[PDB]
Amino acid sequence: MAQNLKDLAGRLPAGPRGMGTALKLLLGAGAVAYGVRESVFTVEGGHRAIFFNRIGGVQQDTILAEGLHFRIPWF
Amino acid sequence: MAAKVFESIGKFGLALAVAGGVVNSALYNVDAGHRAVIFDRFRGVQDIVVGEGTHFLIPWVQKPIIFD
Predict the structure, then answer these.
(1) Which residues contact A52 (CB under 8 A, 6 or more apart)?
(2) Given CB atoms, is A52 within the 8 Å cutoff of chain B?
(3) Are B65 and B39 in contact (CB under 8 A)?
(4) Which one of A4, A11, A59, A61 is separated from B1 by 20 to 30 angstroms, measured CA to CA?
């Protein structure tokens, strides 16, 4: 299966310089959009989805009444 | 020249994939209300309370046990 991906990636036409940087920028934008989408969490109302601070445990003082609160991914 | 570029990019990609896999395996999520205990088998169970927190557990040494 790895060799098939090898051939598929290789077969991409050797286009002029512009589209290479274009593809790099597109990948950057895709990753950034994915991160922005993921920074919000499963949220039902009737659930004060509080900030679980990574350090020190739960945020005993950060009591999330009804309101945006972006979870730092992996944090 | 092209073939060398292909091979080098492949080697770099494989190394990146391995590093990403290790980094992913080095993290744990002990939900709050569960304060974690580092399951370190080098020097043991940490009187230093490593509770909630996705502390960087080295793989093969620290498996997250979730203590409620």
Answers:
(1) A58, A59, A71, B31, B32, B52
(2) yes
(3) yes
(4) A4
